[PDB]
Structure to design on (122 residues):
């Protein structure tokens, strides 16, 4: 009936706000990892880069 | 899999480091090997004068 219709219609509109929410609670995790990861690969370019330039200089300086 | 990237990066980074300092020595050293000899030869020929001079001072 139309009575049972209103209860359906409510429940579904609520359902979609949970599901989209669920996506967002994931999305931040997904994107957090990405951001974290960027900081790992870069930070290791840095240290190793110093271990390069400075290695050759002292080698030349020697 | 990002940890993998970086670990692998390091390898190459160290390999290249190795290779550059190791190569650097050959190249640098061989100019030392050359020039040291090359200042000797300059002297070798014209070298009388020093002895001649020194002998004159000490001799009397």
């Amino acid at each position: 009936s139309k009575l049972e219709a209103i209860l359906s219609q409510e429940v579904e509109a609520e359902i979609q706000a949970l599901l989209q929410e669920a996506e967002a609670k994931a999305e931040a995790v997904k994107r957090e990892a990405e951001e974290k990861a960027k900081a790992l690969l870069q930070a290791r370019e840095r240290a190793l880069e110093a271990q390069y330039r400075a290695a050759l200089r002292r080698a030349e300086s020697a | 899999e990002a940890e993998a990237k970086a670990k692998a990066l390091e390898a190459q980074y160290r390999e290249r480091e190795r290779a550059e300092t190791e190569a650097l020595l050959a190249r640098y050293r061989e100019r030392a090997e050359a020039e040291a000899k090359a200042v000797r030869e300059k002297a070798m020929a014209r070298l009388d004068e020093a002895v001649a001079l020194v002998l004159k001072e000490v001799l009397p």
Observations:
- The radius of gyration of chain B is 26 Å.
- Chain B touches chain A at residues 2-3, 5-6, 9-10, 13-14, 16-17, 20-21, 24-25, 28 (CB under 8 Å).
- The first helix of chain B runs from residue 2 to 45.
- Helices of chain B lie at 2-45, 48-58.
